[PDB]
Design a protein around this ligand. Sequence first.
Ligand code: 9YL
Ligand code: CA
Ligand code: CA
Ligand code: CA
Ligand code: NA
Ligand code: NA
Length: 261
Amino acid sequence: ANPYERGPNPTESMLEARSGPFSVSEERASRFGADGFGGGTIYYPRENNTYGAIAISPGYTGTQSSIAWLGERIASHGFVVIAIDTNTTLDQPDSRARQLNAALDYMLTDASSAVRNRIDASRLAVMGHSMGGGGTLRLASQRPDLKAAIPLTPWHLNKSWRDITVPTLIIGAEYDTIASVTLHSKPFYNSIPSPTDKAYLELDGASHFAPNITNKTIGMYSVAWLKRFVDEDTRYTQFLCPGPRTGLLSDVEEYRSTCPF
Ligand SMILES: CCOC(=O)[C@@H](C)O
Ligand SMILES: [Ca+2]
Ligand SMILES: [Ca+2]
Ligand SMILES: [Ca+2]
Ligand code: NA
Ligand code: NA
């Protein structure tokens, strides 16, 4: 048995629902007590166990409320998740990366015992929107010990992520005019070296701001990716390989992966 497996056996329906099988509580990390970032809200399962821990960054102009739905959603599938605020809302991607790292360290030793007792410190991941997705790529590049990375409509000036060894799912938006997939997501995905496990999922019809409102496709595939890689849960492989149907009527415009993993 996998010592990391949590929760009931998955179904597509369960993954698309507004809330997973775990009840979520919240702990507020204030700006002034949080070293190296602007504070945040830690969402965690009420059910006592150890879980993987995830930090999620907003983008330029955004705050924790811009990604809170997704932090809660993910925690409700059995994860400890911090949705951060940055030191300033104008912070650039690589500052965002440092702040994501500080938020992981915060959960591990500065949060309450309720939070720390629910984390397996060895199983960590990072996510983020837009410049926060650029920050996710950078942290993934600098921390190969991470179990997963999920950049959402990522923006970064650096196009080549040739040193990422962390399993990375990049979620792009078809009609993004701020971080165009042509200039941002795709080059990033193409550059992640073999044999790193990876996937690219482009949301049909979507704008740059699709990650800031509840989105069943982002919720389903973010959880499936974290389950597979943070929890070594092979019950989730079914959703990722061969992956979503694409094509004219799909919510997924395009899907690439290195399946089987
Ligand atoms: C809500 C965050 O908005 C962004 O990150 C845009 C400006 O990239
Ligand atoms: Ca709740
Ligand atoms: Ca602070
Ligand atoms: Ca389309
Ligand atoms: Na685009
Ligand atoms: Na992008």
